[PDB]
């Protein structure tokens, strides 16, 4: 961990740089999630998440963004699911999922820009980020805001081919193979605490 990616603070900083550079980040909590900036995620990165991830690809958003899109919570942090109103076909391909993410996060996006339900799963982050709730959703948003992006990111859980969820060592190995950075939620909490 320390050997592969550096001290906690270095892991954080390294993760911001990777994000800004267009690389992904593995975020570990048991469960490691591949994460990317919603604004820059590519089609290829989407394809990788479907292939190596659970395929339940989530769009982490803020409450403001949720309100702006008029997306209710699924049950009285998943909201109701979405699909781009324009520019997609079945909504399932990597390209279509990207199209939907881009539509949701666009500046000036309106509710009508999205149909519901759909194949992209928004997650509303708790205000306060990881200082409030140590979830991958929060970590995603914190990482994006610290990196300098809009506070919206895409995440997916890393899954082994046999269907078991990747363990730390597998997550390290995958990050290495894919030139992603890797950081833990505790690291992030620590970092924010320090720079308070």
Site for a second copy contains 124 (CB under 8 A):
no
**Residue 185 contacts by C-beta under 8 Å, 6 or more apart in sequence?**
27, 28, 29, 130, 134, 135, 136, 138, 139
Ranges of beta strands (E only) in 29-113 are 32-37, 58-61, 82-84
Site for Au ion contains 32 (CB under 5 A):
yes
Give the up-direction half-sphere exposure of residue 34: CA atoms within 13 A in the CB hemisphere.
33
Minimum Å distance from CB 131 to a second copy?
A: 22
| Cα dihedral 120/73/133/16 (nearest 10) | 30
Nearer to a second copy, 16 or 46 (CB): 46
In the chain, what is the straight-line distance between the N-terminal and C-terminal CA atoms, in Å? Answer: 25
Site for Au ion contains 28 (CB under 5 A):
yes
Site for a second copy in 63-102 (CB under 8 A): 74-75, 78, 80-81, 90, 92-95
Site for a second copy contains 14 (CB under 8 A):
no
Q: Which of the ranges 19-27, 39-47, 61-69, 102-110 carries the binding residues for a second copy, by CB under 8 A? A: 39-47
Residue window 161-180: x/- pattern of binding to a second copy, with contact defined by CB under 8 A: xxxxx---------------
Give the up-direction half-sphere exposure of residue 87: CA atoms within 13 A in the CB hemisphere.
14
195 is in an annotated binding site: no
Footprint of Au ion (CB under 5 A): 28, 32, 48, 168, 171, 178
Annotated binding-site residue numbers: 33, 133-137
């Amino acid at each position: 961990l320390l050997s592969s990616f550096g001290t906690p603070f270095e892991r954080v900083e390294n993760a911001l740089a990777a994000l800004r550079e267009g690389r992904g980040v593995m975020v570990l909590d048991n469960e490691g999630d591949m994460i990317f900036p919603a604004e820059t995620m590519t089609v290829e990165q989407m394809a990788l998440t479907i292939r190596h991830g659970s395929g339940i690809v989530c769009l982490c958003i803020t409450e403001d963004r949720r309100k702006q899109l008029d997306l209710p919570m699924m049950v009285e942090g998943f909201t109701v699911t979405i699909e781009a109103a324009e520019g997609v076909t079945t909504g399932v391909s990597a390209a279509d999922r990207i199209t939907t993410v881009r539509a949701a996060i666009a500046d000036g996006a309106k509710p009508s820009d999205l149909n519901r339900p759909g194949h992209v799963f928004p997650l509303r982050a708790q205000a306060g980020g990881v200082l409030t709730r140590g979830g991958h959703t929060e970590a995603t948003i914190d990482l994006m805001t610290l990196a300098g992006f809009k506070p919206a990111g895409v995440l997916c859980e890393l899954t082994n081919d046999d269907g078991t969820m990747a363990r730390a060592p597998e997550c390290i190995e995958f990050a290495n193979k894919h030139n992603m950075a890797l950081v833990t939620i505790e690291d992030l909490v620590a970092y924010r605490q320090a720079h308070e």
